[PDB]
Amino acid sequence: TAPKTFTHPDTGIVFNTWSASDSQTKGGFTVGMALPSNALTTDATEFIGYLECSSAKNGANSGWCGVSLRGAMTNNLLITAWPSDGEVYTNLMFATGYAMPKNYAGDAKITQIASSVNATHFTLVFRCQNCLSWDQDGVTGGISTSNKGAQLGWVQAFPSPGNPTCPTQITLSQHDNGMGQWGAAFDSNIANPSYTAWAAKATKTVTGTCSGPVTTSIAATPVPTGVSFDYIVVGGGAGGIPVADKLSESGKSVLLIEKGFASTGEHGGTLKPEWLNNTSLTRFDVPGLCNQIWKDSDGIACSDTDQMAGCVLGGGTAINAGLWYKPYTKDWDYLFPSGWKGSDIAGATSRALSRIPGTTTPSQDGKRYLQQGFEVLANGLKASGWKEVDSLKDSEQKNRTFSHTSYMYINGERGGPLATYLVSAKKRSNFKLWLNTAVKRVIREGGHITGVEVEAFRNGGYSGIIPVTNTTGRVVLSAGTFGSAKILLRSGIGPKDQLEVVKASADGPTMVSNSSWIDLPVGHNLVDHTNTDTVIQHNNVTFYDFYKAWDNPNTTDMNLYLNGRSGIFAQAAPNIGPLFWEEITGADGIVRQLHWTARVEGSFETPDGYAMTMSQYLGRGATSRGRMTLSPTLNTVVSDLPYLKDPNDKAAVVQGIVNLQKALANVKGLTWAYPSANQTAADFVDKQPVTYQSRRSNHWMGTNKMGTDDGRSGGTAVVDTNTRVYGTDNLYVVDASIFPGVPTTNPTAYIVVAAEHAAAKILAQPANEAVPKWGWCGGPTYTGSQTCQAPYKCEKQNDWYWQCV
Ligand SMILES: Cc1cc2nc3c(=O)[nH]c(=O)nc-3n(C[C@H](O)[C@H](O)[C@H](O)COP(=O)(O)OP(=O)(O)OC[C@H]3O[C@@H](n4cnc5c(N)ncnc54)[C@H](O)[C@@H]3O)c2cc1C
Ligand code: HEM
Ligand SMILES: *[C@@H]1O[C@H](CO)[C@@H](O)[C@H](O)[C@H]1NC(C)=O
Ligand SMILES: *[C@@H]1O[C@H](CO)[C@@H](O)[C@H](O)[C@H]1NC(C)=O
Ligand SMILES: *[C@@H]1O[C@H](CO)[C@@H](O)[C@H](O)[C@H]1NC(C)=O
Ligand SMILES: *[C@@H]1O[C@H](CO)[C@@H](O)[C@H](O)[C@H]1NC(C)=O
Ligand SMILES: *[C@@H]1O[C@H](CO)[C@@H](O)[C@H](O)[C@H]1NC(C)=O
Ligand SMILES: *[C@@H]1O[C@H](CO)[C@@H](O)[C@H](O)[C@H]1NC(C)=O
Ligand SMILES: *[C@@H]1O[C@H](CO)[C@@H](O)[C@H](O)[C@H]1NC(C)=O
Ligand SMILES: *[C@H]1O[C@H](CO)[C@@H](O)[C@H](O)[C@@H]1O
Ligand SMILES: *[C@H]1O[C@H](CO)[C@@H](O)[C@H](O)[C@@H]1O
Ligand SMILES: [Mg+2]
Ligand SMILES: [Mg+2]
Ligand SMILES: [Mg+2]
Ligand SMILES: [Pt+2]
Ligand SMILES: [Pt+2]
Ligand SMILES: [Pt+2]
Ligand SMILES: [Pt+2]
Ligand SMILES: [Pt+2]
Ligand SMILES: [Pt+2]
Ligand SMILES: [Pt+2]
Ligand SMILES: [Pt+2]
Ligand SMILES: [Pt+2]
Ligand SMILES: [Pt+2]
Ligand SMILES: [Pt+2]
Ligand SMILES: [Pt+2]
């Protein structure tokens, strides 16, 4: 009621002010008025206002202020204020009821003088012309300044307005932070001779912009207090899912964090073509729909990499063709160290094949479809003396061999880890699943990981830090070849220059200190199958589209799938003809594996129908390696290609094609589109560019290589034979990134088998125990526990020695 006098320090203007108490609102609220010289006698039509308002939390630019001029919200002119960008915006509103007020169409105008914004308050000094009398529709109101005083209402809110930069279009909910009104009465200072000079300082103006609605926000859930896990696995995928289940059989608490959203039907996925609406099936569930990922991939695939990777539950297993194979045991013999050889891995290979047996006849009616294309090549090959084997039992015949396509499917829908391992895991109470949640890095005190930092990627997901239960807790990185290498780098584990790139980013202030960095060759030894395409034609080739089966599917086949789980839709797009294999000895005395897959599709210039493309995959035995690195904002890039470096790698690719022509030489009516018949094989291979767009197989591997040679000693291995990161207590990597090289076939089978094997070694490892005072807690050769008994701290003594002190 009684006015406080307040002189503005900046502009020099004297206000009458009225404030609210600390109970009425928090952060505080103050109004002020400045009137003309004659104002205490005759009614003034204008005034100079002052607003000091509050931002409590949401606290940078947020909240809004209001004033009602005869004080009730209704049938009076409202003035509404709020910060955005660091400026202050206002709007003149008029409310009839106690719903959201409209814009005031009338002669009232606000022009600014001075403004302030900071973490506590936002200030405004403005000038209101023609604001003391109003009309809207049929409503007359006003206040007489000679009374002497006025009724004033006020409000304050916690959230900032929607469309906060476009005043005409703003969106509000009811005022949170407080409300009330005064009996405010005037005195000496509200009428000043200096007034008309004060109102010429109204020159200032603010720039609004409309631009439409906003998609940016991502509201998140903060991480539960007093919760921890025995194992935390990062990412659902070929490695992630199977390892999380097998850990969860132990009874220990397991959490699985995944950046993606729900993928298949069973797990709550919604993405479908318009003709799957009336079922629970989803585009990831139908095999014949699997190639649409090359047409519309948005939000399905990772934005932080220059390559194709699924960010969805099941990762690669959700977007791939589903090809499944009993692993060739020689691949383990050649690639892996001891404990991972063919004989050690035999146990876990049967366990994986029991949960996911795979099938050569995905259709549940019992036989195959559009096999005429398959037939041409199949018979043409045994004519040159090749041998049909079943790729699901004697896996040992990879030389001059073909087989029927073999999938991971179960009941004619996409099979694999999502349909088996992740179901039997969800049934358990210890198991928990978090989606739409990105892991930024692991948190660690020295070589011991305490917990992991998460950031909500999409809405459902979580922000903040989850701990592992202490001293025993373990983290497993399953986030894929590029994803896992990235997490390590951001965790201060990797080559120096890459860590510097991280330190120089927006991650840097919060990043681990470099006193604790671990030098490992993360990102080195990048490797991929080397893919090369050839094209043939025959009149026997039956083409099926599959791309417009999205929109306008064949009705006999749609009804055949939906009703019976049969028809062409139960096998992979595109229709995948025979798989065949050849091993080749080079002049360097290495045997390089070839893996051919044939699908009935057109390639570079050869139109679809009559056409079969034959993709050669250069596998195990290839010597060439690349490297992965980080962009300045921490995108993963392939800066060194692993394709056709060694001249003997290229020799084998060329050989393969020659041998294939000789073996298809006697077949009726067989064209060769590529290489065209005027062209030699070597000439063709050489015209193919060696570039990841031309030659990549999407089988990326090896960026944290497993080996017995510690990286910190100038060896090549990031993780040891138990899949644990050198220099660490609790930190493991289970996924394609540990493979020292590519296997014969498509890697998903090899990865799940490998996840089975690792979860057994991990579990077999003795519990971790804190190091006593004076004990050895670290340095470049140290393999033991990295954490001290409390209060004691790990401290560095030499350049080579850390002890608990
Ligand atoms: C286009 C394509 C086609 C393929 N076709 C075949 C095929 O026909 N046959 C075959 O056998 N294999 C195929 N694969 C290859 C095979 O799927 C991959 O090698 C396999 O998926 C590797 O599994 P992974 O667990 O190592 O990584 P992924 O399977 O990619 O799983 C990684 C998971 O971790 C999650 N993640 C990543 N970053 C984070 C983060 N920081 N925080 C939390 N979670 C994160 C990802 O979202 C993803 O879900 C294909 C792959 C692709 C990309
Ligand atoms: C959509 C946003 C808004 C909603 C839902 C809203 C709703 C309300 C409701 C329901 C009441 C009191 C209930 C009652 O009297 O029974 C109220 C009171 C009030 N409102 Fe509004 N309001 C909104 C925006 C504003 C604006 C823009 C102003 C003025 C700047 C404002 C100023 C007031 C004041 C001063 C009071 C207390 C005095 C009174 O009862 O009139 N509100 N608000
Ligand atoms: C923010 O501004 C308000 C008034 O405009 C002032 O009271 C407060 O001290 C300022 N905050 C800081 C941190 O200076
Ligand atoms: C399928 O569902 C989507 C989801 O809203 C809808 O947009 C589409 O029209 C539906 N198609 C039908 C019912 O044929
Ligand atoms: C082409 O198809 C016909 C029947 O459709 C078959 O008799 C013939 O053997 C096929 N050609 C080859 C090369 O298999
Ligand atoms: C693969 O088969 C070819 C042809 O029979 C033969 O020349 C080659 O030595 C074989 N390689 C191996 C490793 O058996
Ligand atoms: C660690 O960082 C500081 C600057 O942040 C730098 O001066 C120091 O040399 C770094 N340590 C090493 C070993 O380079
Ligand atoms: C749809 O597929 C069936 C085979 O199941 C075929 O007989 C029919 O002709 C196809 N329809 C069209 C329009 O091609
Ligand atoms: C587990 O945590 C507490 C507090 O964080 C610590 O004092 C205790 O020593 C830790 N466990 C062991 C075995 O030291
Ligand atoms: C985290 O918080 C969100 C709200 O933004 C919830 O919708 C979600 O269920 C999760 O618990
Ligand atoms: C973290 O805060 C939660 C609030 O949900 C409590 O339940 C818990 O005891 C801890 O203080
Ligand atoms: Mg309130
Ligand atoms: Mg494939
Ligand atoms: Mg770049
Ligand atoms: Pt006076
Ligand atoms: Pt505007
Ligand atoms: Pt929980
Ligand atoms: Pt869609
Ligand atoms: Pt060998
Ligand atoms: Pt469930
Ligand atoms: Pt913590
Ligand atoms: Pt149906
Ligand atoms: Pt080379
Ligand atoms: Pt591609
Ligand atoms: Pt074991
Ligand atoms: Pt070290």
Numbering used by the authors: 2 to 806
Mind quoting what the paper says about this structure?
The overall weak density for the CYT domains suggests significant flexibility in the linker regions. Overall, NcCDH has fewer negative surface residues but displays a similar trend of negative charges clustering near the channel entrance.
An oxidative system was recently discovered in which extracellular flavocytochromes, that is, cellobiose dehydrogenases (CDHs), cooperate with copper-dependent lytic polysaccharide monooxygenases (LPMOs)8910111213 to catalyse redox-mediated glycosidic bond cleavage in crystalline cellulose, hemicelluloses and starch. CDHs are large flavocytochromes containing a haem b-binding cytochrome domain (CYT) connected by a long, flexible linker to a flavin adenine dinucleotide (FAD)-binding dehydrogenase domain (DH). The DH domain oxidizes cellobiose at the C1 position to cellobiono-1,5-lactone with reduction of FAD.
